[PDB]
């Protein structure tokens, strides 16, 4: 209890906000659909788990889609100034993004800091996922310099974090626009309600963005059509086929499309159409090269027999369960872990081609043994394919360098034969 | 890039904002059913359609029951000032209605200016059309006078045209409040179902509307009570009957 004088950061923090009493300032809120978000977001992290790699979040595609948008709609870099006591517009070089990051001190109080990513608008997806994590690594290590504060032309805060709906913030002096993301969330409305009943009606998850922008330079018009672009990129095909091509996952990424009725052929018998489409044909797309080449002269199949939209099925039914009729040795499944089954039973580094057969007994031996999967090898094994492998490199090498001129037809490239024939 | 002095429409659009600055405002936020509007919308467009006529839109509507309420709530038009030095209330003669209106210009700039339709007090529904489509009209064509721009007591914004769900807006010096209507569209969390799904349980369209006020003058309660004026009159027979009969 009682008075105590503001000191340090927090003295910088209170001056900065006495000052931005002089910008006028008004605000956009809109509502978009967040249901394409959670289902790409979760193709790629499956990736990148598999290659020991790292892990991406909402606020990285947001930024991404933001950064996009102010390059469509340029106005909402600018900034107000009076200079020799004249009205004047500043119209910037680069696009710098601030990030707001909130990190506690040594003493034990929290307080924000808006640090800068520079020259975003050269950038693709991973060079601009690396910039974000290299800003917030050092940010907790505590090696930020001065320069990383200064420059910033627009900035991102993520209040839905904590579970804020949305929310009014300040602008700060230098800017023209900063852009807030709120809780991404069914309605309070739904909160009770049953899985089952959510998936039966078709109900999707929400999230609210904001733009709060200084009227002396931005208009109402190019605010609101701001958000209607970055609302258009969330549910575009063409954005998101940039970002997997860029994090090197093989699929086809999840569409948007409406919900349509169980009329006609019933849904059930579209699962079982899929389930054989894979059986006899998802080689096709299996990762068996290990370049990422394609020859230019040859014809490449046809498979759209192998994304879910050809059967007349939508991401509206990946909860949903279905009659499978034995598959997996279960009456009964969802279609996200059919899907899932079919991809680590034909989608790997084993493509099989076995359906052409005419005999039945052969057929089920094959298609049992090859669901089933590869055992996990001991540590005895692994051994001894690590001394196999050594043995074919090892004397390639030495003829090599003992021998130059003379000719060998080596099996370097292929040095798995050795273990495939042991 | 680089800087450059603001000239023209747009330096007057700076000082005024600057301006604004010396008003203490606050805003109000009330969600609308809007199915019988889309209804009652589209059967007096087929008649018009048959006797070769125009088009009514929902701002000609929305603006109709604005002034309905406007009457029923007198505050809502007083403005603030201060005179010899005292703070005083000013009380005006009439409802004069300000249009907000995005038009591009020769240069390849957009703009919005604020038109205003007089003595709005005193209008039926075939009036109140005639006058909103001249303001337009001559907006277009570039024929709007100074006269056109002045007395302005209260305005209206339609920012759900683009399809932005509600706005925070600044108020000018002059005025009482400012109103604004946001998108009419399904809520976003039913916008992957299908028609029939939505059908089975009744779900219905919104709209939601904004009241911004200048606190020295109106008081909260009040900016509550004009909303809840204008949702009755949209949902009202008696509201309607006066549309079809004029038209
Ligand atoms: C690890 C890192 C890659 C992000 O990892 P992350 O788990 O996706 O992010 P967080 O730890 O902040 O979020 C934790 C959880 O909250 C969720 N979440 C975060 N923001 C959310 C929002 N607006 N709405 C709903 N859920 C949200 C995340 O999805 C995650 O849930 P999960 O269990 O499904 O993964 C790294 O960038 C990081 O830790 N960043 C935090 C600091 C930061 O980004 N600050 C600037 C934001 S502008
Ligand atoms: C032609 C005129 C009679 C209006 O015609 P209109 O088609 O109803 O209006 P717009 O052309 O602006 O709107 C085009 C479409 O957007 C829709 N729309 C407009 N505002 C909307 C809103 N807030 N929410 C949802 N849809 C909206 C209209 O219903 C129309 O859709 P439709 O294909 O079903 O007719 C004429 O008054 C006009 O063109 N006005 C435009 C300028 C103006 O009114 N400015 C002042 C607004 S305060």
Redesign the pocket.
């Known amino acids: 209890p009682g008075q105590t004088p503001i000191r340090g950061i927090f003295k910088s923090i209170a001056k900065n906000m006495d000052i931005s009493l002089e910008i006028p300032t008004a605000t956009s809120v809109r509502d978009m659909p967040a249901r394409l978000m959670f289902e790409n977001r979760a193709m790629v992290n499956d990736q990148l788990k598999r290659t020991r790699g ?7 595609i947001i ?1 991404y889609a933001m950064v996009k948008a102010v390059m469509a709609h340029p106005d909402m870099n600018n900034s107000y100034d009076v200079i020799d006591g004249k009205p004047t517009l500043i119209v910037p070089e680069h696009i710098n993004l601030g ?4 990190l506690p001190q040594k003493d034990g109080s929290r307080a924000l800091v808006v640090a800068a990513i520079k020259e975003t608008e050269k950038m693709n997806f991973s060079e601009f996922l690396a910039a ?2 290299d800003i ?1 690594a050092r940010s907790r290590k505590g090696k930020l310099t001065m320069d990383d504060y200064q420059g910033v032309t627009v900035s ?6 904590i ?1 804020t709906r949305h929310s009014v913030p300040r602008l700060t002096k230098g800017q023209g626009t900063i852009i807030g ?5 069914y309605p309070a409305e739904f909160q009770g309600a049953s899985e089952d009943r959510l998936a039966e009606l078709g109900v999707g998850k929400l ?1 609210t963005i904001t733009s709060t922008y200084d009227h002396r330079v931005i208009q109402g018009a190019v605010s609101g059509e701001f958000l209607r672009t970055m609302s258009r990129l969330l549910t575009d095909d063409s954005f998101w086929d940039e970002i997997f091509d860029a994090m090197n996952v093989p699929y086809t990424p999840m569409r948007w499309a409406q919900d349509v009725p169980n009329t006609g052929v019933d849904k059930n018998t579209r699962v079982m159409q899929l389930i054989e489409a894979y059986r006899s044909r998802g080689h096709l797309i299996a990762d068996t090269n290990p370049l990422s080449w394609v020859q230019p002269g040859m014809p490449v199949p046809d498979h759209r027999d192998l994304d879910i939209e050809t059967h007349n099925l939508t991401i509206w039914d990946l909860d949903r369960t279905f009659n499978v009729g034995g598959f997996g040795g279960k009456e009964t499944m969802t279609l996200r872990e059919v899907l899932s089954r079919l991809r680590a039973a034909y989608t790997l580094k084993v493509g099989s081609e076995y359906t052409h057969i005419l005999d039945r007994d052969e057929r089920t031996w094959l298609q049992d043994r090859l669901e089933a999967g590869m055992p996990k090898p001991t540590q005895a094994e692994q051994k001894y394919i690590l001394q196999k492998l050594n043995a074919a490199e090892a004397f390639e090498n030495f003829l090599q360098t003992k021998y130059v001129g003379q000719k060998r037809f080596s099996l370097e490239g292929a040095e798995a034969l050795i273990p495939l024939m042991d």
Do not use: C, Q, R
């Open positions: 790292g892990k991406i979040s909402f606020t990285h930024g990030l707001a990051i909130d974000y994590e917030v991102l805060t993520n209040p839905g974090g579970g993301v709120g809780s991404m969330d999230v």
